[model samples]
Target chain A: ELPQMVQQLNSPDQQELQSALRKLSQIASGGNEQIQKLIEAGALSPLVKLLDDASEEVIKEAVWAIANIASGNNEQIQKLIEAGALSPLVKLLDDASEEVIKEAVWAIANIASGNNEQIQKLIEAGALSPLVKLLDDASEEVIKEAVWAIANIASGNNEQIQKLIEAGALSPLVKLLDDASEEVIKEAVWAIANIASGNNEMKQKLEEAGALPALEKLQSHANEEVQKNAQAALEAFN
Target chain B: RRRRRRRRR
Candidate 1:
């Protein structure tokens, strides 16, 4: 059955290939064994190439597969990185299509969830600046995805945290501290808390970025998790 | 296709 799917992936017929990719996209949704099966079936090669397909639908499905694959585990994420998926995925950062860019950022966010080397590759692939820009202004969903990724990168070593700060990630992040969406506030506070993790310079940057006072607004907020994170970050600033 | 959420570190 999978062999048939792979064959259709190579089909010259657009409809055939599209349906195949869509099915692969469905299977890519998670579960380690299933994810491993898709990767073992040699799906990564064409999946990466289709990132630039003429049909936005095909491209969307490609990113869907990659993003879901990235969701599996660090080992699965490495398979995607080894296939040269980073640069092409980053290239879609500014894509005009909303569905395309949403999945693009979401895919990148999942990739950012990897180990230091994985996150470092994203930096080398030039994902930071544009990602920081997304935090400032993109559709709300896109901004939320960017926030999740930045929160992850912020959890990395001091160098990665400093990279985010220098990329102008702080100001936009401070803006999100007041975002109406509770989900956005949760991750946004998490980044702030992580950055302030027992590092004077990093804590100082949060203060200068005017994050200290903005945090007070959430000190007793409705969401306990948010309030707790806001409290934790404030303690770090001391 | 619905994409699963990857927990951030």
Candidate 2:
């Protein structure tokens, strides 16, 4: 089925490339077997190369395909990294197209949720600065995805959390607590909760940053899960 | 022992 689609990746026509990427995106999301097939078909390098395509739609579809492949298991994600995804994915965080930024962040988030080494690869690729910088993006959707990426990174161990904190995430992340979007607020809470779950020194840092009162207010958030996470963060202080 | 000796003295 994908024999032609794979060949279409290298097609000179932009429409062919777009169609190929579209098909690859769906196939990548199918399951591990299909994703492996995409990988074996020499899919990753062409896809990664398209991250800079002249057409925003092509870039978006390429990133979508890459994000789906990155969402696979550790081995699949490792292939993505080895195929040179980290830096370009980080670069897309600054794309003029908010849609591209969203998919790029989702890809980075999936990578961040991988094993420790993969998350470290993202950090070492200099993802944190632009990532946290996007917290202030004008687009609520971009901000939400950025916060979600940060939350995934924060869910890593203390080193990752410290990396996020050292990247100047605390203040803006705390600021997001009052974002207009409830989804952003929830992710901000999850990030803060992970930070609070760190060592005593780390917990004290968050507490000193005025996290508790912000969390306390969220205790009455309309979303029950948000309230639960907020409550957990509040309890960490005790 | 010294205190007891003092009392005895």
Candidate 3:
């Protein structure tokens, strides 16, 4: 069943490809067992290929599938990277379609949430600069996803946190603390929290970027988690 | 329709 769908993914017929991608997206969303079936059926390469499909629908479905699969365990996400999903997904950040860009951000966020090696792959794929650019994207959804991705990357080792800092993430991230979306504020606070958790030098950098004052304002945010994270970040700086 | 589906997920 999976093999047939995987084969149909390459159909020259647009409808057929769309159908196959939908099925793959469904299975990938089915959790570990079904995602493993997708990997075993050689779905990764075909899915990566579909990332470039002229059809925005196909690209959206492909990114959705990869995002779901990436939400799986480390081994599953590594399979996605090994199958060449990383760079192309990074490229999708520049996609003309906002929906495609959102899905792409979702996928990369999941990839960044993976183990250190996987997070490093995202960094090496040049994900930082594009993702930082996304912080200013007109779409709030894109901005939130970018914040999540940056937060996940910041949660990594010193090197990964340093990459985010190098990409000029601190200022924009601090700015997001005032974003209209509470979700964006929460994530931005979380990212700053992670950055502050880095060595004193990193903490000092964020402090110098005005993170301390921005986080101070968030400390009283209505959301408890956001408030707590902001408090923790403030504490980290001191 | 696609927009609705994306939201539900």
Candidate 4:
């Protein structure tokens, strides 16, 4: 009952409610079973609100809370979708703060993970062009999360591959396959793997776009999973 | 029969 009062407090006096939301974010960050209980208790609406809050900490907690909820359940995913969360997350691209923007990127990526239907919602919400602009974000975390989102989105359609190629994403993606952090490279490989899975013509087009050699080089990566995915990427063309 | 480059040039 007290928690319900916190939701009401958010609209009338936002500052104190933002603080309480941050506390909830920290508690929820532990990811015990109670996290879903918070969602089920209708706490998620307020967190989604804090995600777009002007305050940095408030937005950070919102991102963390969204990440916590964005796992394993169709209902939670539907809740995220129905709340119209992606547009506010998109607004973060124009945010002055790099940290806030990066958190928003990760939060949106988490929301979109394995949830293919949201891909169209995000695109319709004008996510692609702004996200494309972030490929040049100075922050490595932002760039990494942007890369994850790209990989997820490009997973949806081969025309997306052509769209990426047309937008000149292919070269940077290939270069990052060598230079990016482990997670970044893993996501790049997965994206490339998905694009490479298109028909023979796209496989050949990706090769022409220089994905093939980069993937072959990654096959020798010291990380076992990267190496496995890299090898699978190689065989994907076959 | 397939060598058309020279003819086109």
Best by lDDT: 3
Give model 3's DockQ, 2 decimals.
Answer: 0.05
Off by more than 4 A, model 3: B1-9
Pairs with backbone N, CA or C atoms under 3 Å apart (clashes), candidate 4:
none
Give the better candidate number (2 or 3) by DockQ. 3
DockQ versus reference, model 2 = 0.00
- Residue-wise C-alpha lDDT for candidate 2, range A194-214, written one tens digit per residue: 777788988888878878888
* Model 4 misplaced stretches (Cα beyond 4 Å): A5-15, A26-35, A157-168, A220-225, B1-9
Which candidate's TM-score is highest?
A: 3
What TM-score does candidate 4 reach?
0.79
Which of 3 and 4 is ahead in lDDT? 3
**How close is candidate 4 at the interface, in terms of C-alpha RMSD after superposing the true interface residues?**
23.1
Residue-wise lDDT of candidate 4 within A203-233, one digit each (tens)? 7778887888888888778899999988887
Candidate 4 yields a Cα-based lDDT of 0.67
Cα error, residue A207 of model 2, in Å, equals 1.2
Best by DockQ: 1
User: For all the predictions, what are the DockQ values?
Assistant: 0.12, 0.00, 0.05, 0.01
On the 0 to 100 scale, the lDDT of residue A58 in model 4 is 66
TM-score of predicted model 2?
0.91
Tens-digit lDDT track of model 3 for A98-201? 88888888899888888889889999999999999988765887898788888888888988899899999998998889865898898788788888888888
Question: What is the DockQ ranking, best to worst?
Answer: 1, 3, 4, 2
